[PDB]
Amino acid sequence: VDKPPYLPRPRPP
Amino acid sequence: MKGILGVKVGMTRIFRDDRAVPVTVILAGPCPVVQRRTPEKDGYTAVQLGFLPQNPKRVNRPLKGHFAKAGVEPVRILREIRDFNPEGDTVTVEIFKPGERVDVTGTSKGRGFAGVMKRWNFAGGPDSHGAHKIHRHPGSIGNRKTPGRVYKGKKMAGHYGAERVTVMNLEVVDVIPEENLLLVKGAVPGPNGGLVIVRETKKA
Amino acid sequence: SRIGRLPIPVPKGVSVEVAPGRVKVKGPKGELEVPVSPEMRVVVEEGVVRVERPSDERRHKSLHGLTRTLIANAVKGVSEGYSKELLIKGIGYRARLVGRALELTVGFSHPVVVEPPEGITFEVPEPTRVRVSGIDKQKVGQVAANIRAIRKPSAYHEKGIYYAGEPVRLKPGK
Amino acid sequence: MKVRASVKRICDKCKVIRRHGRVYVICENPKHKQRQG
Amino acid sequence: MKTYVPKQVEPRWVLIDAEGKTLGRLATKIATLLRGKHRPDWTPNVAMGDFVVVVNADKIRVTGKKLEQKIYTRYSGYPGGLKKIPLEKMLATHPERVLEHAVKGMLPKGPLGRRLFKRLKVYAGPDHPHQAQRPEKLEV
RNA sequence: CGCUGAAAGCAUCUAAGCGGGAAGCCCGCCCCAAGAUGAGGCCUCCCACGGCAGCCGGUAAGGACCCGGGAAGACCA
RNA sequence: CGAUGUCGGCUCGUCGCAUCCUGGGGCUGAAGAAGGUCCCAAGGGUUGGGCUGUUCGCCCAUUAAAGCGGCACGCGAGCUG
RNA sequence: AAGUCUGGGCUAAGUGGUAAAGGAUGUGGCGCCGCGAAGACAGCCAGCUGGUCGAGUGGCGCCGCGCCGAAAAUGAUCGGGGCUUAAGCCCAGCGCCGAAGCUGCGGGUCUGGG
Ligand SMILES: [Mg+2]
Ligand SMILES: [Mg+2]
Ligand SMILES: [Mg+2]
Ligand SMILES: [Mg+2]
Ligand SMILES: [Mg+2]
Ligand SMILES: [Mg+2]
Ligand SMILES: [Mg+2]
Ligand SMILES: [Mg+2]
Ligand SMILES: [Mg+2]
Ligand SMILES: [Mg+2]
Ligand SMILES: [Mg+2]
Ligand SMILES: [Mg+2]
Ligand SMILES: [Mg+2]
Ligand SMILES: [Mg+2]
Ligand SMILES: [Mg+2]
């Protein structure tokens, strides 16, 4: 259930 | 089946056997029959009742014709009772004796555009702990790509009240025929001054 | 090894009329119609009724035996008439008659009152025997079962509503 | 009632009957009553 | 020479007793009548078929166990809104719907096909209200 | 779970037929609803206009506009 | 891969039925009461707390019961983080 | 679009129109023994024999087609309607429909021969 994220959680430009 | 038209007048409690009993007071009589619906002519059975006297200065000609064929003074409200056919030319509160149970129909108070909390008793959002401008919002409204849509009948904000409501099986606490008054135990839909219908109950 | 082709003795003096898909049986105790397959042929002989089939395939064979017994049962019904007897076993348990009606006092908090349908007659000799009597055999059989259902035979005690001649097979208590 | 894919005769008094499209096995011994399913 | 196309003609009214007929087999013919494919000057893009009046629709007959097993269906748009109604019950409550649905399912889809279905007049009971147009009895 | 009952002289709730049997199913209760274009029904009102299934024009019964408001309401209604 | 935002919670449901409860059954090594076991049934219901980010799990106090799953491990252009 | 075509047969589950071990007096067709007008199986009256009944009966196997076994998540459905001596399945036919394939007619271009 606690799988690893695949996207980095968004930084601002 | 039997019924009457009426106006909601207001609420009180009276005393009966060392008990306080909440009542709504209803002015029901007198309602003249202005038309009878017959199975040969209409295909069902009913009685058209008139209620509250009207200034003939405000009644147009097609309406005037209808009343005259019944030989009835111009009235403000017309409404039918289904499967009820009184022997007389006039229906009064006396069709109800105290102890009888009745069904009352009125027009609920109108809340206009109602939020999802007031309307559907949603829990809304948290008020602290990070809640972001969603304190009275409804949350999710669906799934994802399956079904990729929102159900018909999804409870959502929108108008609320000002709609037909019937509350059932109310005790008739007293009736004061000399004032065309009915005393019903408990609450009745709508505002004071509101038009209401009083029918013999359908519960057993 | 056959039933349909076995002829049907007809007592004096019951009449058996024949129609497409039905035979009417009148007698000293009433009338009864018997629905019959139009494929089957009923035959009015002297002092006798016979049923004939039109082939020896499975469905016709099945109807044949049934049709003969159906009419045979009708014949006996209007002459001798039918009955079934119920025994009542159990200490508090008794039955009585209230008009045409049958009243079972059989262990509930209340008594149960059974109404006899058309063509059925109730009887109470002892307070523990009940005779269901009528000219319709399936009807007598039914109503009887109905009565018995009110308080079926216990599994542990010789107690309840019993068919006449039904055995009292019980199980032990711990 | 036992409900199985294998309904068999259990004793010499069992009887494979078929009613309403279903194979039952009825018998004098209540334990032996079976429906196929 | 170009293919003959018909100018509008007076459409024929027709009457059919459905008593004891086999639901689907009667339907087939009703559809054909509606499409006018029995007419030598048949044209696929106009209504030139007949008007079909049917009586005794309650007395339509059907084979097998379909009285109990055939299921008519209605989705309402709402969750759990699939209603199922068996043949038996439909006949007891809206018997003309039985034939109507059958014929409807066998007409083309689209604006013309819907117009054709409108020229079907089905009634339970032996009588119909269209004596005025004096429909011609058909044996099918 | 039965009644009656053959095929299969017995038996069998079934193959003809008939009963009993769920908070479940259909109806019943409350609400919406004829755009139900399959556009339903009943009561009442107006009426046969002037000019060359159309058109322009003044009207009838009635409607709207405007206004005082409203436990109706975002505007609209 | 010129982006299909990823656990848990909150909110809002909806569906399945291999049914936790309530309803109807058959068998019981079913005396009664209470259970067991299978069958029918998805209408409704299915609590509040302690611990941990937890889902899960243990635990406290209750309950008719404290069901299991699907919906992008339902739901971040709804919130949290 | 063209057969509610013709002839023989099976299936009663809507099987056809989603699956296995395995289970079954489902139905039809073959075969094999056993018992029996010296009276058999069933029913009923005694002790595997006996008595009245008067015909068949009882088991084994092969083949066709069906039955159960068969629970999953938005609304169902064989594509749909609808189909039961068929509008299903097996065997045998005759006829039609059907493509930008083939033919008829006209044309273009290239290549080869006149
Ligand atoms: Mg971003
Ligand atoms: Mg009426
Ligand atoms: Mg009526
Ligand atoms: Mg009445
Ligand atoms: Mg009103
Ligand atoms: Mg607010
Ligand atoms: Mg509020
Ligand atoms: Mg509210
Ligand atoms: Mg809250
Ligand atoms: Mg709050
Ligand atoms: Mg909360
Ligand atoms: Mg909270
Ligand atoms: Mg923030
Ligand atoms: Mg912020
Ligand atoms: Mg805030």
Ligand SMILES: [Mg+2]
């Ligand atoms: Mg939200």
Ligand SMILES: [Mg+2]
């Ligand atoms: Mg998402």
Ligand SMILES: [Mg+2]
């Ligand atoms: Mg979708």
Ligand SMILES: [Mg+2]
């Ligand atoms: Mg409103």
Ligand SMILES: [Mg+2]
């Ligand atoms: Mg009402």
Ligand SMILES: [Mg+2]
């Ligand atoms: Mg009460």
Ligand SMILES: [Mg+2]
């Ligand atoms: Mg009360």
Ligand SMILES: [Mg+2]
């Ligand atoms: Mg014989």
Ligand SMILES: [Mg+2]
């Ligand atoms: Mg014979």
Ligand SMILES: [Mg+2]
């Ligand atoms: Mg019995």
Ligand SMILES: [Mg+2]
């Ligand atoms: Mg086994």
Ligand SMILES: [Mg+2]
């Ligand atoms: Mg054995």
Ligand SMILES: [Mg+2]
């Ligand atoms: Mg059944």
Ligand SMILES: [Mg+2]
């Ligand atoms: Mg037995």
Ligand SMILES: [Mg+2]
């Ligand atoms: Mg047919």
Ligand SMILES: [Mg+2]
């Ligand atoms: Mg036909």
